[PDB]
Design an enzyme around this catalytic site. Structure first.
Site, PDB file in Angstrom:
ATOM      1  N   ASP A 105       7.423  11.526  45.414  1.00  0.00           N
ATOM      2  CA  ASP A 105       8.747  11.965  45.819  1.00  0.00           C
ATOM      3  C   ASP A 105       8.626  13.421  46.245  1.00  0.00           C
ATOM      4  OD1 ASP A 105      10.600   9.841  45.722  1.00  0.00           O
ATOM      5  OD2 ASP A 105      10.626   9.879  43.524  1.00  0.00           O
ATOM      6  N   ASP A 122     -30.483 -32.732  51.588  1.00  0.00           N
ATOM      7  CA  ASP A 122     -30.070 -33.863  52.410  1.00  0.00           C
ATOM      8  C   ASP A 122     -28.724 -34.451  52.001  1.00  0.00           C
ATOM      9  OD1 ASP A 122     -30.685 -35.172  50.042  1.00  0.00           O
ATOM     10  OD2 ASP A 122     -31.991 -36.669  50.965  1.00  0.00           O
ATOM     11  N   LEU A 165      -6.078   3.047  39.040  1.00  0.00           N
ATOM     12  CA  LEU A 165      -6.544   3.451  40.363  1.00  0.00           C
ATOM     13  C   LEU A 165      -7.014   4.900  40.337  1.00  0.00           C
ATOM     14  N   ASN A 205       1.747  14.186  41.336  1.00  0.00           N
ATOM     15  CA  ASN A 205       3.127  14.654  41.417  1.00  0.00           C
ATOM     16  C   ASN A 205       3.982  14.072  40.294  1.00  0.00           C
ATOM     17  OD1 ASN A 205       5.117  16.154  43.200  1.00  0.00           O
ATOM     18  ND2 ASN A 205       6.065  14.120  43.204  1.00  0.00           N
ATOM     19  N   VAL A 258      -0.893   4.608  25.046  1.00  0.00           N
ATOM     20  CA  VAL A 258      -1.517   5.912  25.263  1.00  0.00           C
ATOM     21  C   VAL A 258      -0.849   6.979  24.403  1.00  0.00           C
ATOM     22  CG1 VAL A 258      -0.074   6.150  27.322  1.00  0.00           C
ATOM     23  CG2 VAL A 258      -2.048   7.670  27.003  1.00  0.00           C
ATOM     24  N   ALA A 297     -24.969 -43.054  42.262  1.00  0.00           N
ATOM     25  CA  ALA A 297     -26.156 -42.574  41.558  1.00  0.00           C
ATOM     26  C   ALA A 297     -26.804 -41.373  42.237  1.00  0.00           C
ATOM     27  CB  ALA A 297     -27.185 -43.698  41.406  1.00  0.00           C
ATOM     28  N   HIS A 308     -29.150 -31.295  46.461  1.00  0.00           N
ATOM     29  CA  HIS A 308     -30.207 -31.698  47.371  1.00  0.00           C
ATOM     30  C   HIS A 308     -29.810 -31.266  48.773  1.00  0.00           C
ATOM     31  CE1 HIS A 308     -32.122 -35.082  44.745  1.00  0.00           C
ATOM     32  NE2 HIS A 308     -32.877 -33.998  44.734  1.00  0.00           N
ATOM     33  N   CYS A 332     -31.117 -40.578  51.596  1.00  0.00           N
ATOM     34  CA  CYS A 332     -31.945 -40.500  50.396  1.00  0.00           C
ATOM     35  C   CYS A 332     -32.861 -41.710  50.271  1.00  0.00           C
ATOM     36  CB  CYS A 332     -31.061 -40.358  49.157  1.00  0.00           C
ATOM     37  SG  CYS A 332     -30.485 -38.673  48.840  1.00  0.00           S
TER      38      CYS A 332
END
Lengths: 235, 130, 639, 505
Positions: free
Chosen positions: D418, D30, D452, D353, D490, D118, D28, D124
């Site tokens: 490197d 409020d 990446l 590399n 892999v 409640a 709500h 309210c």
């Protein structure tokens, strides 16, 4: 087990002790393990296998069945789950939704056990089938997760621990197809000198000491490589 | 940021009001952005010539006493390759295998944001007796 | 009373193609009469005559192609059929069937194998069965490489079956194995399969095929078949081989055979938010994945902004028990039968103690009503993986475990008459969980915690003890390990031989066994703090289930697991939330015992291990961090 | 519902500023929001999404914002009754009271905890009937149609989830059902958004996967010319991977050189439109703006499927490019990848590399801060690997098999490199250019364990291409429609693939 009036050693006095990998490296470790297994089998050596449902989930039911058939497995330590999944794959060609599990359990319960279901022609293939046929002692320890259970699974765990220790007695090697709870319990029950083969796809290979060998692959793939290499010391 | 011609200009104009780069420009802290093949668009600051970037990295690393490495695996190995042994290396990540850098170096196996939050809290409990 | 085969000539590559067709044309010419049909320009794939239709005796069922690229051939083929005195039958324009490519007779004539899954429809098998007056055995194709039955299935004479099992699902393999004995099965290895070895023509003992492995040919020769190879690679480039380039018009007739179908059809209705949640889509995926087919009949939307949608679906399944499985999976998501088709539930009496009749319905977690004596009866004690026992004289229905089934019980059977009524910024989930726990704690609701030794190892003993103190824990479900680790950390300031098979474990266990249980050991000031201490002091019921790994168990640890499961179900009753801080085995069992209405919080550091059927919330963090955050957030509701 | 906000304004002749609530505890307004006199606003920002928070901050100055800490918010502090000078609330923090007193408000606390149990606090329990009178709506409304199998796919659910998660609302019109699976059933949906910018943002993601405007409402596209070099108009349309057509001069023009994360430049006399990177953009180029006028359109079995696809594409289908990382070498995959290069399965190589130095080390020194500097130095001596292959120093390996069979390769540099081999580019703009060149016309791309790197290469690839991504972690598994990923080692993948392609063609 301590009985009244037993004299138990106390203190420290007077006691002495005479005592994920790439598939490329996995196949080398498998070669070493297969050679050790062939050596222990060609003598009167005992090999005990502790299995979990992961053996079934990864397509390793057939390979473990071959190992039991060809006399490489002298005892089986497992639980309710691995038995129900093996029997489900044997009957319906699948495993794990939940429904098929209970029907299988009910069917097995109707026969009153795995042995009855084997002789009645309900189980024609599988790990439990080869254990019943080739007379291999097995023990299914219960767990709180167990559905049913199957008539065979020991739901009183002191009795199950006793049977586990019994089946472990003459062992030279223990194939651990990693159920972490099962593997740690069986390891706590085994003495030193025994070679421990621990396989899991998890870095759950917390295996205390070499006295052994741990493998980090898919357990079904491990079983396939092991059966392939062992079928080369049979030609 | 490209339209403003750089991060410093975008901060001085008022398009970037908060953040790590904002605080780096404001308190005049030198930074170096090494380029990558994955770069979707170079900020005017991002060095796309990696020999210049490596030179600048060695320059900024000089005289360092500690290096806090926050979840750049590719960068962490390169910066370590640039660093001498005397510096203490703090490498934080959840992987946890990228925490394997080798008592002169500390590795931490957690979430980097949680690590930073705990670090700021403890540094407060250390520099805030006021 | 002869062998007649229809073929169609192909009027850089193409030169070889013509030669190969001629090579094949003569080979079949040596074994049977080869009728030709005039090709058409613009329809090159007309050479694959197997897709023209399906012939038995004098009736031909013309094919209805799935895609538009070969539909233009349908008229010309029909013309040929009508010109040679065949009673042509056509399928509804919506009902595809690709001819003898997806329907292969057993060579003895006992039945017709028909495939479904890619190009031919399951709902078309009754049409074929009625129009050709033969038995139709339905098989589902699952591999896109073999979308046609005749590329992975080849019935041979002598009762033999040459096929590639990986092209079929588990049910279809079960059917095939039921009908063909293992001595009569010639399994094809994958290398042969991808070269269309099953796309072979068999007359009596001769098998005409393209070039295959020597091992397959020898396996065939051992069964008594004589292989004749002919090159057809040019057609292999178009997904066709010898069987595809032929259509057998003289198929054997066993007058004792009539139409037969295993297929069952049913209509179901689904009301509700079928648009947002995507429940209708989940229903259709459930149907297909279980080897069924569907046609959505009516989608009626309620009020058009965000009101409830209602829909009708026809569901077909090849087997009655495939229909049973499909129907259970649908019933878990509403799926009531159409209001006029509503039947009551069937039952069967229990003859063996603790065993159920095979066709018994398996209960789910969701609350269910069953129609007994034409009235809706709510099912009591809702649990998954149980049987439903109904009483006739009063109106009850209850879930009961298989082992607890008593003789003479009426257990539900069939499917009729049932209705169902590492990550960060965890602190947000912790805020929501803390607020929900405060809600359940204020009003009168049970919160149950299932804990494992990870709680102690990760520094969570004190926080869980605080949770027990502040009335957030109404039952504790755990094991031997967590109790011994908690008490070890409380007594010696260290769990698992380190800061919270070591000897501290046994010494702690030994002391607790000396006192005869944990409660006594608490009364003799031996356990002054901890989770078990707060459970005994504030008198929270706990149950320590045994494990095969349990070290010389504590007197409290229940080593009889049937009793432990009973006690677990006892303590779980009436729960509003379940905090699960342990390994899966403990958590999976507690979940298997709980109904759907209960709120499940599952916390663990493994990201893949947080798997639970949202009603359930899962967190992938360190359980100790979760406990500290939860205690802090719950304090912010008291401070 | 957002769709209730136009009614309110129309019925009250008032402006309605829409805020989207995101926190389930404060469902709500409020319970987390309390406008105060003097321009002050007592609220809890975490209860609103980023857009709604931005709106609130744009409208309320910082001197006028009273943020509450989480403790107050969970104690329903914003559920307070305010008279011009009085603020009545539940028990609140002392620090909050001091900040409240700093403004001209005097705090009067009263217990309402029983009602807090409640869902309601003091505000309210009240409804202010004397509201002062001292009509505008920010919401934008549109109906769109999507032509596809809405039931046999999650098309509607993903669309509507996109709408709501982007801070919008929707309404599904009547579902028109077909007779059969060949008659596609399609529906039109009303889509609402509180801001023009948010409507635009919703529409771009919505424009993806069809979502065409109604036939009568729009056949034009807007453009703006590039005033600054290497910059774009603020509202420039961001291109996606999927094939796109744009309506220029009332005609549909297909875009050439489709790449994701680029701008669309259109020319009028030559009526085509092309994708251009921001840095490559030249002055006077016309870049598309807005959303108007754009339209779009298993253990080992997976290896079997990929092998079948590779056999299909190898037969004169299209260029095959493989992106490799040092993980290929570490796991024993050098020989299998080399075999793939020999048997014509690899038409280009994208790497770095590290993979080159590791492959050449395995070929030269075996061994199935390190030796590499010796190897790197040796290669530096020859001035490159191709020269090193022409000399008797490199006889076998992935780089050797690429050089001999003359497969184009590109080694992109990294800050981790490197002291680089002569072949390594090290100027990353040039490297991206060569990468896009080598990707041209490819039908499949083997992505071998470089998350990446592989994601960077994938962003350069068009949509139509089918991609296989392999890693032992589900982290380097991105995806898209055409492309499936593998969770194996892999090296094991390469061994299985070489075996499956062997004796097959």
């Amino acid at each position: 087990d301590l009985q009244v009036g037993d004299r138990v050693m106390v203190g420290v006095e007077g006691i002495r002790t005479i005592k994920v990998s790439s598939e490329r490296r996995v196949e080398l470790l498998v070669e070493q393990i297969a050679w050790e297994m062939r050596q222990i089998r060609d003598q009167g050596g005992k090999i005990v296998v502790t299995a979990g449902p992961v053996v079934i989930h990864t397509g390793g039911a057939q390979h473990l069945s071959h190992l039991v058939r060809e006399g490489y497995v002298h005892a089986l330590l497992g639980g309710n789950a691995i038995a129900v999944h093996d029997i489900e794959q044997a009957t319906m060609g699948t495993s794990l939704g939940h429904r098929h599990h209970l029907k299988i359990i009910n069917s097995v319960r109707r026969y009153g056990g795995i042995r009855q279901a084997v002789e009645a022609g309900f189980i024609s293939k599988g790990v439990m089938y080869e254990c019943v046929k080739n007379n291999i002692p097995y023990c299914l320890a219960g767990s709180i997760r167990d559905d049913g259970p199957l008539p065979d699974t020991e739901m009183n765990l002191v009795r199950a621990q006793s049977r586990y220790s019994e089946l472990i007695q003459g062992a030279d090697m223990i194939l651990m197809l990693s159920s972490m709870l099962h593997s740690i319990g069986v390891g706590n029950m085994t003495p030193s000198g025994v070679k421990m083969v621990c396989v899991d796809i998890n870095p759950a290979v917390v295996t205390k000491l070499s006295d052994s060998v741990g493998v980090v692959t898919d357990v079904g793939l491990f079983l396939s490589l092991l059966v392939r290499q062992l079928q080369q010391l049979t030609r | 940021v490209r339209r403003y011609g750089g991060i410093r200009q975008a901060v001085e104009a008022g398009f970037i009001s908060k953040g790590v780069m904002y605080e780096c420009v404001k308190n005049n802290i030198p930074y170096c952005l090494a380029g990558s093949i994955r770069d979707d668009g170079p900020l005017p600051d991002t060095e796309m010539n990696l020999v210049r970037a490596q030179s600048r990295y060695s320059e900024l690393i000089q005289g360092a006493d500690m290096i806090l490495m926050l979840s750049s695996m590719l960068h962490s190995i390169g910066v370590g390759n640039m660093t001498p042994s005397g510096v203490k290396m703090v490498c934080v990540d959840i992987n946890p295998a990228v925490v394997t850098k080798l008592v002169e170096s500390v590795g931490v196996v957690t979430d980097v944001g949680l690590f930073l939050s705990l670090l700021v809290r403890q540094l407060q409990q250390l520099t805030r007796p006021y | 009373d002869d062998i007649r085969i229809l073929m169609c000539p192909p009027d850089s590559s193409q030169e070889r193609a013509v030669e190969q067709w001629k090579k094949l044309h003569q080979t079949i010419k040596e074994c049977a009469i080869v009728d030709l049909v005039k090709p058409a320009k613009g329809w090159p794939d007309m050479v694959f005559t197997a897709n023209a239709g399906l012939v038995l005796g004098e009736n031909v069922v013309l094919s209805r192609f799935y895609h538009k690229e070969r539909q233009g051939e349908e008229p010309y083929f029909k013309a040929w059929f009508e010109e040679n005195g065949f009673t042509v039958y056509e399928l509804p324009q919506d009902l595809p069937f690709e001819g003898a490519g997806d329907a292969l007779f057993d060579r003895e004539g006992r039945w017709l194998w028909a495939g479904y899954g890619f190009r031919s429809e399951l709902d078309s098998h009754p049409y074929i069965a009625k129009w050709l007056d033969t038995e139709v055995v339905s098989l589902r194709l699952i591999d896109e490489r073999f979308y046609h039955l005749d590329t992975c299935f080849c019935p041979l004479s002598g009762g033999y079956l040459l096929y590639y099992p990986p092209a079929f699902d588990a049910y279809s393999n079960r059917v095939i194995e039921m009908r063909i004995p293992p001595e009569k099965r010639i399994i094809v290895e994958e290398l042969d399969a991808v070269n269309f070895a099953c796309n072979a023509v068999n007359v009596n003992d001769i098998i005409i095929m393209n070039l295959v492995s020597r091992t397959l040919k020898e396996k065939l020769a051992e069964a008594g078949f004589k292989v004749r190879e002919t090159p057809l690679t040019e057609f292999l480039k178009a997904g066709g081989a010898a069987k595809c380039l032929t259509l057998r018009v003289t198929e054997p007739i066993l007058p004792d055979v009539h139409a037969t179908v295993s297929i069952e059809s049913r209509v179901i209705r689904m009301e509700g938010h079928l648009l947002d949640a995507g429940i209708l889509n989940q229903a259709l995926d459930l149907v297909v994945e279980n080897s069924g087919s569907f046609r959505v009949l009516n989608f009626n939307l309620g009020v058009e902004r965000n009101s409830t949608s209602s829909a009708e679906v026809r569901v077909s399944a090849p087997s009655h028990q495939i229909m049973e499985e499909i129907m259970t999976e649908l019933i878990d998501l509403g799926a009531v039968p159409p209001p006029q088709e509503l039947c009551d539930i069937n039952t069967e009496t229990v003859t063996q103690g603790g065993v159920a009749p095979d066709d018994f319905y398996v209960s789910t977690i969701y609350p269910t009503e069953v129609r007994v004596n034409c009235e809706w009866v709510q099912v009591t004690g809702q649990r998954m993986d149980a049987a439903i026992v109904v009483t006739s004289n009063p109106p009850s229905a209850r879930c009961v475990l298989l082992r607890d089934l008593q003789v003479g019980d009426r257990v539900m059977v069939g499917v009729e008459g049932i209705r169902t009524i590492s990550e960060r910024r965890v602190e947000l989930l912790v805020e929501q969980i803390a607020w929900e726990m405060r809600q359940i704690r204020d009003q009168g609701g049970k919160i149950v915690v299932t804990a494992g030794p990870v709680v102690i190892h990760t520094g969570g003993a004190q926080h869980l003890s605080h949770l027990v103190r502040e009335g957030y824990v109404h039952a504790l479900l755990g094991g031997n390990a967590i109790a011994v680790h908690d008490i070890e950390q409380a007594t010696m300031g260290t769990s698992l031989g380190v800061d919270m098979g070591h000897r501290h474990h046994l010494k702690i266990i030994n002391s607790v066994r000396r006192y005869g249980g944990i409660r006594q050991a608490v009364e003799a000031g031996f356990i002054s703090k901890g989770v078990m201490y707060e459970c005994v002091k504030n008198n929270i019921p706990y149950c320590l289930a045994g494990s095969i790994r349990d070290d010389g168990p504590l007197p409290d640890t229940e080593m009889n697991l049937v009793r432990a499961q009973s006690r677990y179900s006892e303590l779980i009753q009436g729960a509003d939330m379940i905090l699960m801080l342990s390994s899966m085995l403990h958590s999976i069992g507690v979940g298997n015992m709980t109904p759907s209405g209960v709120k499940m919080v599952c916390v663990d550091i493994n990201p893949a291990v947080v798997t639970k059927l949202v009603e359930s919330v899962g967190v992938v963090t360190d359980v100790g961090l979760f406990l500290s955050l939860l205690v802090r957030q719950l304090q912010q509701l008291t401070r | 519902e957002l769709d209730s906000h136009p009614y309110i304004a129309k019925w009250l002749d008032t402006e309605v500023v829409s805020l989207r609530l995101i926190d389930e505890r404060f469902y709500h307004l409020d319970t987390c929001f309390c406008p105060l006199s003097g321009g002050y606003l007592l609220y809890y920002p975490p209860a609103f999404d980023a857009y709604s928070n931005r709106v609130i901050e744009m409208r309320i100055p910082p001197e006028k914002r009273i943020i509450v800490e989480e403790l107050d918010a969970v104690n329903f502090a914003c559920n307070a009754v305010n008279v011009n000078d009085i603020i009545i609330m539940n028990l609140v923090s002392r620090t909050l009271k001091e900040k409240l007193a700093e403004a001209g408000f005097k705090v009067r606390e009263t217990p309402l905890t029983e009602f807090l149990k409640a869902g309601g606090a003091a505000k309210c329990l009240t409804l202010r009937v004397t509201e002062p009178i001292l009509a505008t709506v920010s919401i934008e409304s549109r109906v769109i149609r999507m032509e596809g199998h809405l039931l046999d796919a999650g098309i509607l659910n993903q669309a509507l989830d996109l709408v709501v998660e982007n801070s919008g609302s929707f309404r599904v019109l009547n579902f028109n059902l077909g007779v059969e699976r060949n008659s596609t059933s399609s529906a039109e949906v009303r889509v609402s958004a509180p801001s023009h910018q948010i409507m635009e943002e919703i529409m771009t993601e919505l424009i993806d996967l069809g979502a065409v405007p109604p036939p009568q409402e729009l056949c034009d596209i807007n453009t703006e010319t590039v005033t600054q070099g290497g910059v774009a108009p603020d509202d420039f349309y961001v291109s996606t991977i999927y094939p796109t057509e744009v309506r220029v001069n009332c005609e549909w023009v297909q875009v050439t050189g489709q790449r994701m994360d680029a701008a669309i430049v259109v020319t009028s006399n030559p009526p085509s439109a092309r994708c251009v990177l921001l840095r490559d953009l030249q002055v006077g180029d016309r870049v598309m703006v807005g959303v108007e006028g754009i339209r779009t359109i298993r253990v080992e079995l997976l290896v079997e499927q990929i092998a079948w696809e590779m056999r299909q594409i190898r037969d004169q289908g299209g260029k095959i490019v493989v992106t490799a990382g040092p993980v290929v070498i570490h796991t024993g995959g050098a020989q299998h990848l080399s075999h793939l290069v020999r048997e014509g399965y690899v038409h280009a190589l994208l790497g770095g590399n590290a993979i080159a130095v590791h492959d050449i080390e395995q070929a030269t020194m075996g061994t199935s801060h390190r030796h590499h500097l010796k190897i790197i130095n040796s290669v530096r001596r020859y001035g490159g690997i191709r020269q090193a292959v022409e000399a008797g120093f490199i006889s076998k390996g992935v780089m050797y098999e690429c050089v001999k069979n003359n497969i184009p390769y590109c080694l992109a540099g990294s800050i981790r490199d490197d002291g680089p081999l002569p072949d390594t580019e090290m100027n990353l703009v040039r490297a991206q250019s060569r990468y896009s060149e080598l990707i041209q016309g490819a039908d499949m791309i083997l992505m071998l364990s470089s998350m990446l790197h592989s994601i960077g290469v994938g962003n350069m690839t068009p949509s139509g291409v089918k991609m296989v991504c392999v890693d032992i972690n589900p982290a380097v598994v991105t995806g898209s429609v055409e492309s499936v990923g593998v969770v194996t080692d892999v090296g094991l993948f390469l061994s299985l693939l070489v075996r499956q392609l062997q004796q097959l063609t």
